[PDB]
């Protein structure tokens, strides 16, 4: 399954996130891809040998904009680290 926040188990490697088509080519004997700070960023599909880029699905904080209850009860909401056009 692609393009969804999914829990994957690639041949014992357990993780969570969205999978996308990648543009980096591993060597034939390489199966894992690790970036700086030891975070897994890519993996080859054991059935099709096709490289997949793993990135965690969206998270962030929520902030409340208010003019004060003494004035009005209307409230706005800001989602900080995401673009909720694709929430």
């Amino acid at each position: 399954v692609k393009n969804k926040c999914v829990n994957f188990n690639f041949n014992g490697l357990t993780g969570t996130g969205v999978l996308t088509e990648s543009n980096k080519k591993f060597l034939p004997f390489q199966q894992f891809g690790r970036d700086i700070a030891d975070t897994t960023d890519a993996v080859r599909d054991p059935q099709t040998l096709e490289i997949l880029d793993i990135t965690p699905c969206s998270f962030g904080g929520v902030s409340v904009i208010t003019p004060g209850t003494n004035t009005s009860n209307q409230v706005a909401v800001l989602y900080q680290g995401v673009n909720c056009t694709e929430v």
Binding site: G60, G61, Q80, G81
Partner: peptide, 23 residues
């Protein structure tokens, strides 16, 4: 040009942009 360059961690953007500081 001379000076250039998670797990719950995040980076809040500054309030004034570089264009406003230049202005």
């Amino acid at each position: 040009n001379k000076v250039t360059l998670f797990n719950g961690l995040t980076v809040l953007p500054p309030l004034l942009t570089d264009e406003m500081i230049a202005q």
